[PDB]
Design a protein around this ligand. Structure first.
Ligand SMILES: Cc1cc(CN[C@H](CO)C(=O)O)c(OCc2cccc(C#N)c2)cc1OCc1cccc(-c2ccc3c(c2)OCCO3)c1C
Lengths: 126, 125
């Protein structure tokens, strides 16, 4: 059975830092990009939509624009790794990685964001 | 692009009734069952997992046992229809129909359940 796995289902990140969250999927021999779909979302916000080798970068939800990318090198290793730069308080929540590759599955990853009072105070009022 | 569509994204149903929630996907001519995956969930509870022409009967969340089925005949028409019988208050929430068929997509459907006072003591949990 096609199974997506996550080495970590919980990440704790500091406000302003970068994060890479990972979901693994089975690749026998070499990856066939044309058969691969990778989708990342958080709470109904679309983050990544990689379809048959072509990424839709522009349909990323505006809160992630210019901050989120799929590490394409890692796909050939069977690793769907989502990198988010400049982590914000609004980035905390439950992410899902959905993968179709001759089989389909998804997993959840929880992200917690620590932040100092100044950042928390802005988030609190914005 | 492969697109799953829902004619309705909202269902309002009565406690104890039956519901059929529908999601469509494109099927050009003859369905290739071996390439089709249909998955239904609500709040990450597995309802339907139809893979390689076969349901996985033991993977269904216990709260849907005996009550939820995918109507297999509809699949060749490009209709992934989830039929839920004997609707309970716990069935209210946001459902997702996830389809892989030479392409992948999903849609969300909201279900509201109306119920009399007596049933409404789901309040006691
Ligand atoms: C067939 C299938 C089996 C399974 C069961 N997977 C296990 C292994 O973990 C097994 O077989 O024992 C599945 O599991 C989802 C799930 C996740 C987490 C917890 C539970 C539980 N309990 C269930 C989801 C699933 O279908 C998920 C699915 C189905 C169809 C399409 C997509 C999909 C993929 C990529 C997409 C997409 C949908 O739409 C937008 C564009 O990108 C997905 C994720």
């Amino acid at each position: 059975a096609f199974t997506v796995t996550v080495p970590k289902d919980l990440y704790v990140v500091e406000y302003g830092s970068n994060m890479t969250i990972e979901c693994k999927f089975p690749v026998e021999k070499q990856l066939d990009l044309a058969a691969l779909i990778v989708y990342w979302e958080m709470e109904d916000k679309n983050i990544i939509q990689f379809v048959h080798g072509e990424e839709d970068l522009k349909v990323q939800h505006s809160s992630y624009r210019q901050r989120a990318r799929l590490l394409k090198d890692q796909l050939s290793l069977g690793n769907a790794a989502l990198q988010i730069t400049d982590v914000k308080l609004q980035d905390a929540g439950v992410y899902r990685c959905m993968i179709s590759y001759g089989g389909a599955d998804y997993k959840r990853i929880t992200v917690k964001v620590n932040a100092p009072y100044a950042a928390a105070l802005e988030h609190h009022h914005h």
